[PDB]
Amino acid sequence: SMEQVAMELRLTELTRLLRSVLDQLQDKDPARIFAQPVSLKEVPDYLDHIKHPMDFATMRKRLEAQGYKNLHEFEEDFDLIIDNCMKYNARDTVFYRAAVRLRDQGGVVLRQARREVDSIG
């Protein structure tokens, strides 16, 4: 149908906007701490601690499959990155501290993303 096409164009445009959002958030992680999944070869107990691992490569795979229907779903995955790290790592670690800085800096980006998503519909 024409409606299904229109819906698909909306999703494509959301995917475009979320790709720009993802790029902007990933720039706030210049150390690349959150770039890839925590290695289960290197942290073999990880899944005993963290039940829903997340990282920016995994988000990108979902994004490019157009697997984010709305900004809430995308934000859920970004919050997982941060919250997983803040639980597994102690406060005095470079990992925890990187997550705090990513949360703080990302907030700004996500605030305007929400306005744009609502504004453009």
Side-chain angles (χ1 to χ4, degrees), residues 1-2 4-6 8 11-15 17-40 42-60 62-68 70-110 112-119 121:
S1 71
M2 209 27 250
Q4 289 299 316
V5 169
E8 296 160 359
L11 177 61
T12 297
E13 285 306 298
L14 177 64
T15 304
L17 179 157
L18 297 179
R19 189 179 306 109
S20 172
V21 175
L22 184 65
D23 290 347
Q24 287 177 69
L25 295 171
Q26 187 153 26
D27 288 336
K28 311 312 181 155
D29 172 31
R32 301 192 70 85
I33 290 164
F34 305 105
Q36 292 292 332
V38 172
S39 173
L40 308 172
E42 303 170 359
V43 187
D45 75 357
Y46 189 65
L47 299 185
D48 295 343
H49 291 267
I50 295 303
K51 298 296 172 185
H52 297 97
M54 192 47 53
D55 63 277
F56 288 127
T58 301
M59 289 188 66
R60 194 172 294 280
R62 179 166 171 194
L63 180 65
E64 289 317 330
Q66 299 187 350
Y68 294 115
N70 52 56
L71 183 57
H72 182 75
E73 288 187 345
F74 177 95
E75 289 173 321
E76 287 198 325
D77 272 353
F78 179 66
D79 284 339
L80 279 176
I81 293 178
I82 298 314
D83 292 340
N84 290 342
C85 183
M86 293 175 72
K87 293 167 183 81
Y88 191 81
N89 304 104
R91 233 162 3 259
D92 72 331
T93 63
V94 62
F95 306 108
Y96 185 113
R97 290 168 171 282
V100 166
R101 290 166 62 83
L102 174 63
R103 192 200 57 191
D104 287 351
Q105 297 193 274
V108 179
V109 173
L110 291 168
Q112 203 51 43
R114 161 57 60 207
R115 292 190 67 84
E116 288 179 349
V117 166
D118 293 358
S119 188

